[PDB]
Amino acid sequence: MVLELFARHVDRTPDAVAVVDGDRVLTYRQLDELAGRLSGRLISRGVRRGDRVAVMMDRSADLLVALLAVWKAGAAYVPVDAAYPARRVAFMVADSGASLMVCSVATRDGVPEGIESIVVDACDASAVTVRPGDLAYVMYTTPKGVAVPHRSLAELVGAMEPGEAVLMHAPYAFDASMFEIWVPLVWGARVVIAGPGPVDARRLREAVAAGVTRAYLTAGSFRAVAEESPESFAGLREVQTGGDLVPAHAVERVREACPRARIRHLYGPTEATVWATWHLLEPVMGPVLPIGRRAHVLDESLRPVGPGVVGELYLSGAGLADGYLNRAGLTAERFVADPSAPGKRMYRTGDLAQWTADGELLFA
Amino acid sequence: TNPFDNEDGSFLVLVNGEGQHSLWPAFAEVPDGWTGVHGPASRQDCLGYVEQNWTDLRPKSLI
């Protein structure tokens, strides 16, 4: 549970940096207090457990405050991107069923008509009880609202040292960026948010010099640096790409420059989330997916395929979302029953995979 | 094509203990912990039954 882990690091290291967003720098204590105050405001304006709050903010530093505040009220967070047209924004607020929208002064213009608005920019104490099944998020792909339980988010976060730093592009409504911002905070590390624009080799070299040990990068920037200077990746223990799986050539270039670096790609969508690590394949480097302690590769008859055969990937685990809001039929065809696990579901990725002779799960 | 996508297929509607519904191919064995609720029928008919009867997507264990 992100809130419970975050609270620990607020106790042990309150004065440690949590967010570095341009000019704005927030300690663990500051981020907690700002969220607590905004949480109280949400409770006053009528936010109750299980309610859904739409949030549309430019800056990441603000984004984190709103998030924790929503969770402190017991509510669920609906990320809205200021860029979306009002048709999108109005629909997402309608589908989610959000009564109130949290915004900044810059984004206040986007608030659809008939939505109560709170502006973060412009004391009562609550004590709420939450359970892992409660929703933490509603993430939209007409767009489909994916209901993400707190437990699913917990699996993804469930390793970094305190004071370690992760360089991340600005969080986006995209599934990748939205969950990543948590990972540093559960470990006591600090999010360092990249200035807008492609990450360049020098910015990467500058960031690692500042103490960044991990980087979450767009597929485009990774390929650019991989061509420009594979050596710039040196110093990073883990480099992670989001979006389209990067060409294998780029990954092999970066590996020759930095043999120690671990390259991963977050292929999964919000419904089922998968973290994949590039490894040298037996034939080369290829994406490898952890089986865990689960994944199935199944044929058209839903019977498990043999080793070396390609089949559709079904994912079963705690990370699976509850379903698509207001789309019961779609949830039923996508979140099918899992034969291996009683009373459980497996989510069809629509992605091909195959088993290696070693038993490692391989993307295709 | 995915079994759950095929329109020429006969399908079943399954429900687990949490009230969650799943389409299921008629040739497949029903997994343990899942119970059938709507006889062998077309893909659309089953989807209709789900849209009608699975009203609350929340797991039942959370009230």
Residue numbers in the entry:
A (entry chain B): 1 to 122, 129 to 147, 153 to 169, 174 to 298, 301 to 310, 316 to 386
B (entry chain D): 2 to 64
Report text from the authors:
In this work, we have sought to understand the evolutionary history of lipid II targeting glycopeptide antibiotics (GPAs), a vital class of nonribosomal peptides used in the clinic for the treatment of resistant bacterial infections and exemplified by vancomycin (Van) and teicoplanin (Tei). Since ANC1-3 domains display polydisperse elution profiles in size exclusion chromatography, we instead turned to the characterisation of an Acore construct of the Hpg accepting A1 domain from Tei biosynthesis (A1tei), which possesses a homologous pocket to ANC1. The MbtH-like domain Tcp13 also exhibits the anticipated fold, containing a 3-stranded antiparallel β-sheet and an α-helix adjoining the centre of the sheet.
ANC4 was highly specific for D-Ala, with an activation rate of 0.89 min–1, >15 fold higher than activity towards L-Ala. Whilst unexpected, this preference is consistent with D-Ala being present due to cell wall biosynthesis and remodelling of the cell wall that occurs upon GPA biosynthesis. In this structure, the substrate binding pocket accommodating the small D-alanine is mainly formed by the three residues D196 (numbering for comparison to other structures; D190 in crystal structure), A197 (A191) and L287 (L281). The reduction in pocket size is largely attributed to the C296W (W290) substitution, with the increase in bulk displacing L287 (L281) and shifting the residue upwards by ~3 Å forming the lower surface of the pocket. While Y237 (Y231) is hydrogen bonded to the main chain carbonyl of G263 (G257) in the A1ANC2 and A1ANC3 pocket, this residue is rotated downwards in ANC4. This rotation appears to be facilitated by a hydrogen bond between the Y237 and the L261Q (Q255) substitution. The new Y237 (Y231) rotamer displaces F200 (F194) and allows for the loop and β-sheet in which G263 (G257) resides to shift downwards, thus further limiting the pocket surface. Optimising mutations then provided the route to the modern M1 A-domains that we see in Van-type GPAs, with Ala-activating domains undergoing further major reengineering to finally activate D-Ala.
